[PDB]
Amino acid sequence: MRVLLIHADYFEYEVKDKALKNPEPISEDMKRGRMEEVLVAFISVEKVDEKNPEEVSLKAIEEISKVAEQVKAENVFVSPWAHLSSELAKPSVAMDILNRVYQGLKERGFNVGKAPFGYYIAAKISCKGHPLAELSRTIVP
Amino acid sequence: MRVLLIHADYFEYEVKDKALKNPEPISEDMKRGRMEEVLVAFISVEKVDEKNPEEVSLKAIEEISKVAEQVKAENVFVSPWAHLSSELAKPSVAMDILNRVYQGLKERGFNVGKAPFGYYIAAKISCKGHPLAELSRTIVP
Numbered sequence: 001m002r003v004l005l006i007h008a009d010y011f012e013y014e015v016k017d018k019a020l021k022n023p024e025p026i027s028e029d030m031k032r033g034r035m036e037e038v039l040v041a042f043i044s045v046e047k048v049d050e051k052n053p054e055e056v057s058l059k060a061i062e063e064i065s066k067v068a069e070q071v072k073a074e075n076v077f078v079s080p081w082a083h084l085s086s087e088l089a090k091p092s093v094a095m096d097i098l099n100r101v102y103q104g105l106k107e108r109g110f111n112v113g114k115a116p117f118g119y120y121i122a123a124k125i126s127c128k129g130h131p132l133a134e135l136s137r138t139i140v141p
Numbered sequence: 142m143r144v145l146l147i148h149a150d151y152f153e154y155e156v157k158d159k160a161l162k163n164p165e166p167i168s169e170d171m172k173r174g175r176m177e178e179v180l181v182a183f184i185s186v187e188k189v190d191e192k193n194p195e196e197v198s199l200k201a202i203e204e205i206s207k208v209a210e211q212v213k214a215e216n217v218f219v220s221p222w223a224h225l226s227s228e229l230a231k232p233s234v235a236m237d238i239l240n241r242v243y244q245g246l247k248e249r250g251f252n253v254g255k256a257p258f259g260y261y262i263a264a265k266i267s268c269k270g271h272p273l274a275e276l277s278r279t280i281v282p
Contacts, residue, residue, distance in 0.1 A: 014270070015269075016271070083277040120271060124266065128263060129264065130158075134224050135224070
């Protein structure tokens with residue numbers, strides 16, 4: 001798993017076309033979402049993660065939590081992101097892990113948001129620019 | 142070299158604190174910059190690139206150009222980005238390659254902008270959300 005963490009003033013997205021034939025279904029109100037003062041977690045689930053969904057999820061939960069605690073973000077957003085890796089996991093594994101990370105961050109106490117899987121999405125973000133505002137982490141079994 | 146390419150409605154940045162003791166010097170007017178309808182090129186220069194600055198630069202020039210031509214972006218922005226790699230090049234090599242890529246994109250005919258090296262930078266971006274709007278490429282000797 002590869003993750004890019006961005007401490008942001010705001011992050012807003014709008015779902016555009018489907019990238020998969022059968023993407024994640026969504027209500028009208030899940031097409032757009034916005035959070036402020038938010039640690040955005042751009043997550044690229046890999047093939048190698050298929051071997052241990054739960055361990056990988058637990059590490060990602062913890063690595064993301066630490067940074068959010070260190071930067072004093074109460075809000076966290078989980079986004080799927082095909083763009084930190086070339087060996088990517090099949091969608092079942094990807095959605096599995098993305099939901100596990102989403103749930104475990106809720107369990108830690110953050111106000112957590114997410115984006116639907118399997119779509120092209122427009123987004124806008126304002127990146128803060130302090131020293132810990134942009135971090136990347138690599139997570140394996 | 143690792144590159145993330147983002148086709149954007151706009152990209153605006155503001156230089157904040159120095160990340161290096163001796164960063165790239167800049168006039169007042171280089172502290173902020175904005176472009177619209179722009180292919181932003183987030184570039185992470187690696188250790189392995191120290192071996193062939195010019196080849197690596199030529200490939201990056203071409204890979205970026207193709208995408209800009211394919212997405213019909215006349216504007217290209219080159220940003221240094223420490224966040225696509227763990228084995229990063231020393232700053233001399235990094236600035237060397239970043240300037241070569243900047244110059245060669247000017248030679249191709251794009252209106253090209255860049256950001257200063259060696260600073261923490263705040264930025265905002267609106268990502269387009271069509272299928273080719275977010276691409277990553279890996280470039281080696």
